[PDB]
Write a protein that binds this DNA or RNA. Structure first.
Ligand SMILES: [Zn+2]
Lengths: 177, 141, 49, 76, 117, 83
RNA sequence: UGAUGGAGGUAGAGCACUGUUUGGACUAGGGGCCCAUCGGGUUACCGAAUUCAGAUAAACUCCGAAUGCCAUUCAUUUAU
RNA sequence: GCGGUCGCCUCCUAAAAGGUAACGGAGGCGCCCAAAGGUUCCCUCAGAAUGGUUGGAAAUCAUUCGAAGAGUGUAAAGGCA
RNA sequence: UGUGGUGGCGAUAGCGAGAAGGAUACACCUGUUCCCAUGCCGAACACAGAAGUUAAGCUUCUUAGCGCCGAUUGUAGUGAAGGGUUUCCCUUUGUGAGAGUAGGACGUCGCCACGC
């Protein structure tokens, strides 16, 4: 795919330039993409997860899970064992093809055009860059989707400080403002 | 019937204690202090009376230090009730003081007003007292 | 709810064992594989009718 | 007008043989509730955490470093 | 992310195996050691702490790579060196592993070549 | 990949309305038109309206005669009257 | 009686756990109300993030005695 | 006399083996689970900080610190990483 | 003698901090066709390999910041004798802690194999 080729060609020796790494193993890679349809309304009517999974199965290449509860909250009417949300992890080469879809198609199809907010820091190489709508992807059907909720993306690197992750995402598209 | 200071309960009735002797527990805040050199219970109200007999010679400055606090509780039955049934309802909050310990402390005021206020205090407590400085330290500062 | 119960050997026709159940969690009759002292062999046991 | 005055019987725990004895097979050594002393050589644990002596011999007590103690029987 | 180590977990599994029976008076241990490129084994008594016979993968006589076949050769070596000193009823360490591959390759090769389990 | 319980996917080559980027993969399907050897031998029909160059975050300021339908819906009828 | 090994959490210390608590430093941020009908949140109490010093406990313990108790192919005297 | 109590299990009083009373100080019981049992594998909690759509002090997430501050069907002790 | 495996001994064995290394070995890493696997995910688990890197893990060396082990000595407490108020205190004789310390301490012992 494209993004391993960019790592092999240009990304790694530019990293050895801009941080003076003594070995190639010092270079930070990318590991995960975690996605969370946080519904919270299957407790009211259980047919809310029943289309969130339908949307995630199209967006990803996997099926999501169904998440448990671990608590019992009076205000949201929660007990133990409650179906609330749905994880999707990504590994391997479907990391890079989904990131190709993110860089090319998705991120320029949002109103109030600014791209990527630059403050997602967490100090330690993790930019949770959420999604407001759902109609962004090419595979979204107006004749199927009703609610106007959104997604989660947890970009996970092995980088120590956020100076490194900024340069990696600068060398991987990611239109910061 | 004026109680200044109380606790939050966690147990109503407590065993009537048994106090023998103490030591140390010296001046550390702050510059002039008492020493109760007998051993007695000391109730709430005595510490109110000691407060006010302190503070009416502490005009515009000088710190008051209260180092003893009523933790424990007495109980008492009625009059006309025989011996017999369970322990009566607790009325009062009293803490023990052995020898050695220090009732109150003062700082920020010269010596004469200090000994005035301390002898005004010690006629309201049932223990023979003394008056001791923060006498010597490794650094007095 | 619960009932002190007895088992029944389905071959030698005896009342051998005694145990418990909760008759709203188990509506139908118990069947366990137990040991029969009369035949000296593992034999299916049902609930006494 | 009191709602107290309730107890259990005393159930008589504690070590029932010292060190240095000659101890026959299967006799109780230190009756517990809750494991306070673990077994070592030739000593097992019953249902209510008691401590036997499997083989005839001499009870001696030990310790597992810092926290807890051991019982073990040496014949021989 | 800390990449977690891969011997701390193996030795936690050793510690939760070796509680029950090592028991190596005259029915000693075996051993099974993965690596990325080797398979080792030892025969250990306690409370001597002293091994009795051993063999290893890439030291002496090989057949393939990180194969079951190398492990079968190792098990042949261990069982043949053991029975020259009169040992019959050794006890397996599982190590910290399972029985799928590279381990039963040692095991059932060691059974048929003299040992007893 | 656990068996039978994962969704559908084929590495579908992109296109565009303008200049046609042809590199990528996809998941959804259609009627195949250009199975292409230089890429994945799959559908072309992901034919997005966005190049990620058409938006003025990469190329620069290019919208003055931008001439797109609803844009011209006001800016042609009186837009000939405008200019 | 002497020697030796051991079981245990009383007395005293009693801070580390849980309860009761006293003064100082501090805001992450609350104020009836401000400067108001974006930042300074004047004064105010400051709980918690904390952290210095100082106390208390039958149903608090990081610790821990004399003594008694149980044992010994052990020693001396005695006669149970 | 009117009140209260009468069997069982935990803690304290109980004087550091065991035992020890009072119309002394505190709480539970007269069941439950066909898996909450047996074995064989695998696993490690409560919280806090920092970011992230709905989303709120407090749901699903992500990284880090975290010997226990958790859980153990049920009262209390003794245990259990 | 280096490295790996593998054992006991109370962390005096630890935690934090810093430096160095790849002969062998160990580890990371490449990949999934096969035994096998994910309540989704070759991340682990399992199996095939060997392009490279000592960055991490691992090994060696330095360090008394946190933690651990701490003698002697003084005091509280107390058995046995006594004396006053009798709530409590004091004197001879035997035993002594808890705190607070000087100090120890950045391990010790045993086996097999490989390379040298
Ligand atoms: Zn029968």
């Amino acid at each position: 795919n494209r993004l391993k080729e960019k790592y092999i060609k240009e990304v790694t020796p530019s990293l050895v330039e801009k941080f003076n790494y003594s070995s190639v193993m010092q270079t930070p890679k990318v590991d995960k993409i975690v996605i969370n349809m946080g519904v919270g309304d299957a407790v009211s009517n259980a047919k809310n997860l029943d289309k969130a999974v339908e949307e995630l199965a199209l967006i990803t290449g996997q099926k999501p899970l169904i998440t448990k509860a671990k608590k019992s909250i009076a205000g949201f009417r929660l007990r133990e064992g409650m179906p609330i949300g749905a994880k999707v992890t990504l590994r391997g080469e479907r990391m890079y093809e989904f990131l190709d879809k993110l860089v090319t198609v998705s991120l320029p199809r949002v109103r109030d055009f600014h791209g990527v907010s630059k403050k997602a820091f967490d100090g330690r190489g993790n930019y949770t860059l959420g999604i407001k709508e759902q109609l962004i992807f090419p595979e979204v059907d107006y004749d199927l989707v009703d609610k106007v909720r959104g997604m989660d993306i947890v970009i996970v690197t092995t980088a120590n400080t956020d100076e490194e992750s900024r340069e990696l995402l600068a060398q991987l598209g990611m239109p910061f403002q | 019937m004026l109680v200044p200071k109380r606790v939050k309960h966690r147990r109503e009735f407590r065993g009537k204690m048994r106090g023998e002797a103490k030591g140390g527990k010296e001046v550390a805040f702050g510059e002039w202090g008492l020493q109760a050199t007998e051993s007695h219970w000391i109730t709430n109200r005595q510490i109110e009376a000691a407060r006010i007999a302190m503070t009416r010679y502490m005009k515009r400055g000088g710190k008051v230090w209260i180092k003893i606090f009523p933790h424990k509780s007495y109980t008492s039955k009625a009059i006309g009730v025989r011996m017999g049934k369970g322990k009566g309802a607790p009325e009062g909050w009293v803490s023990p003081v052995k020898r050695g310990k220090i009732m109150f402390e003062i700082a920020g005021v010269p010596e004469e007003v200090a000994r005035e206020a301390l002898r005004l205090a010690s006629h309201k407590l049932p223990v023979k007292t003394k008056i001791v400085k923060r006498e010597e330290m490794g650094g007095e500062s | 709810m619960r009932v002190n119960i007895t088992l029944e050997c389905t071959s030698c026709k005896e009342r051998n064992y005694l145990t418990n159940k909760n008759k709203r969690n188990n509506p139908d009759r118990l069947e366990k594989q137990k040991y029969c002292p009369r035949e000296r062999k593992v034999t299916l046991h049902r609930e006494t009718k | 007008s009191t709602s107290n005055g309730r107890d259990s019987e005393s159930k008589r725990l504690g070590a029932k043989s010292a060190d240095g004895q000659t101890v026959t097979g299967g006799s109780i050594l230190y009756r517990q509730r809750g494991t306070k002393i673990y077994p070592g050589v030739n000593v097992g644990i019953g249902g209510d955490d008691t401590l036997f002596a499997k083989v005839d011999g001499v009870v001696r007590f030990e310790r597992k470093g810092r926290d807890k103690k051991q019982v073990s029987v040496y014949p021989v | 992310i800390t990449k977690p180590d891969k011997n701390k977990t193996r030795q936690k599994r050793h510690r939760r195996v070796r509680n029950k029976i090592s028991g190596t008076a005259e029915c000693p241990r075996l051993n099974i050691f993965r690596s990325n490129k080797n398979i080792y084994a030892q025969v250990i008594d306690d409370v001597a702490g002293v091994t009795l016979a051993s063999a290893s993968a890439l030291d002496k006589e090989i057949s393939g790579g990180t194969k079951t076949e190398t492990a079968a050769a190792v098990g042949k070596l261990v069982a043949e060196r053991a029975a020259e000193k009169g040992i019959k009823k050794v006890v397996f360490d599982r190590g910290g592993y399972l029985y799928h591959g590279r381990v039963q390759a040692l095991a059932e090769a060691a059974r048929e070549n003299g040992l007893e389990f | 990949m656990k068996q039978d319980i994962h969704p559908n996917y084929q590495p579908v080559v992109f296109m565009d309305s303008t200049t046609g980027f042809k590199f990528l993969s996809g998941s959804t399907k259609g009627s195949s038109e250009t199975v292409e050897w230089e890429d994945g031998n799959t559908y072309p029909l992901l034919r997005v309206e966005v190049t990620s160059d058409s938006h003025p975050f990469y190329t620069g300021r290019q919208k003055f005669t931008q001439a797109d339908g609803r844009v011209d819906r006001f800016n042609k009828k009186y837009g000939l009257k405008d200019e």
